[PDB]
Amino acid sequence: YTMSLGAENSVAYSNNSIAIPTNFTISVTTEILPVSMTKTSVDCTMYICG
């Protein structure tokens, strides 16, 4: 299929109307960030020549 970007949401804009929140949600989200890699050492003489 041809992918859809998102659901269409036409915001009801007018020159004298505002939308004010009456409630709230305390949302906890996860963010995973890599920090380090495995510390690998290669003996060049032993790798090439044994």
């Binding site: 929140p21 009456t22 409630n23 949600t25 305390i26 949302s27 906890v28 963010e31 920090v35």
Partner: protein, 106 residues
């Protein structure tokens, strides 16, 4: 930068070769329409909100904080005066209460 929504706090957690941030954020919800105006015309003076916004539920005008609906009476303590009503486009007529008025009235 610290999660989707208005960032409140974050908590770090260790992970194998990594870190996991639990971002605690504030998300607005249950929004409601209101009729808004840039300024309030009272006694030939233009009043602007000190920290909030003017909202109307249909018949009465209030001032509320921008991120949560908490309507309060439009007074001189939460508004400031700058100029007359002839300059601001879209200024509406409403009364502005004075807390000092019953003090010298009594």
């Amino acid at each position: 930068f610290c999660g989707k929504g208005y960032h409140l706090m974050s908590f770090p957690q260790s992970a194998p070769h990594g870190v996991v941030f639990l971002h605690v954020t504030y998300v607005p919800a249950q929004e409601k329409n209101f009729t808004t105006a840039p300024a309030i015309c009272h006694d030939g003076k233009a009043h602007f909100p000190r920290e909030g916004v003017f909202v109307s539920n249909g018949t009465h005008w209030f001032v509320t904080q921008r991120n949560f609906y908490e309507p309060q009476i439009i007074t001189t303590d939460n508004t400031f005066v700058s100029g007359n009503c002839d300059v601001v486009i879209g200024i509406v007529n409403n009364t502005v209460y004075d807390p000092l008025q019953p003090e010298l009235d009594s």
